[PDB]
Amino acid sequence: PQITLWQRPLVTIKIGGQLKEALLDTGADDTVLEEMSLPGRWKPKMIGGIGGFIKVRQYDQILIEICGHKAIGTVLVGPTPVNIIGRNLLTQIGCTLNF
Amino acid sequence: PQITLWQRPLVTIKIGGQLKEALLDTGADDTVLEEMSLPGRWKPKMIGGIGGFIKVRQYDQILIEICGHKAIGTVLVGPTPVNIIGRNLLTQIGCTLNF
Ligand SMILES: CN/C(C)=C1\C(=O)Nc2ccc(S(=O)(=O)N(CC(C)C)C[C@@H](O)[C@H](Cc3ccccc3)NC(=O)O[C@H]3CO[C@H]4OCC[C@H]43)cc21
C-alpha cells in the first residue's frame, strides 16, 4: 500500500509469535525493538541516536512479518522508546519513498 | 522521484541560503538540523530519541527547499548527529511510503 505521512507510519508486525506495532522508519539503518521475549543466541552491540547511545542485543536471521510480508534479518533488541522497522528490513518488503 | 532504501535516503536542501544534506526520515515527527546559522527568534524545546533527550532551538515558519520542492515549517536546531527532514516537512513535498 501507499502510506502518507500526516500520521506516524505504524504497522502491525508478527515476530516471535507475538504481535507488536512498529514504525516504518527510513532514518533507521537497522530494525530495533523494545525489550521482548526472543528465542536463541545474540551478540552485544551499541547503536547511537538523537540523545546518545543504547546497548542492544543483536539477533541475526530473525523472521519478522511486517504488514503481512515476510522478511528475515537482523533485529536489535533493547531500550528503544519505540519499535522501529529499519532499512535492513524495509528493502525486503519492497518499501520505497516517493515524492 | 522514487527512492529505494538500500542506501540512506539523503537529499540536498537549501535553508538559510546554505546548502546541506539531510536524511528523509519517516521516523521523525519534526525536522531537526545540526547546529547552523539561522536568522531570527526561536523558542527552547527538548525532543527525545534513541539514547535520551537533546535541547534544541525551535524556529517556526522556516523556508526549506528539499530536493527542489519548497516547504515552510518548524525547524529544530541542535546537537542531532545527522540533519533529518521529518514528517512536518515530508507531507509538504508530497512524500509517501510505498510497499
Ligand atoms: C548505526 N546505525 C544506526 C545509527 C541505527 C540503526 O542501525 N538502527 C537504528 C534505529 C533507530 C535509530 S534512531 O532512533 O536513533 N534514528 C536515527 C535518526 C536519529 C537518524 C531513527 C529516527 O527515525 C528516530 C526514531 C525514533 C522515534 C521515536 C523515538 C525515538 C526514536 N527518530 C527520531 O529520533 O525522531 C525525533 C525527531 O522528531 C521526533 O519524532 C519522534 C522522536 C523525535 C538509529 C539506528
Residue B23, class by beta-carbon neighbours within 10 Å (0-12 exposed, 13-18 middle, 19+ buried)? middle
Q: Using CA positions, which residue lies closest to atom 15 of ligand 1?
A: A49
Dihedral angle sign, alpha carbons of residues A27, B70, B89, B34: positive
- In CATH, what number is assigned to the domain containing residue B40? 2.40.70.10
Q: Using CA positions, which residue lies closest to atom 18 of ligand 1?
A: A27
Nearest 10 degrees: Cα torsion B83, B6, B70, B86: -50
Q: Starting at the edge strand that comes first in sequence, how are the strands of the sheet with B96-98 ordered?
A: A2-3, B96-98, A96-98, B2-3
Nearest-CA distance B42 → chain A (Å): 20
The domain tally of chain A equals 1
**Cβ of residue B71 closer than 8 Å to a chain A Cβ:** no
The three cell numbers locating residue B77: 536546531
- The total of other beta-carbon atoms located within 10 Å of residue B29's CB is 15
Indicate the resolution in Å.
2.0
Domain that holds residue B80: 1-99
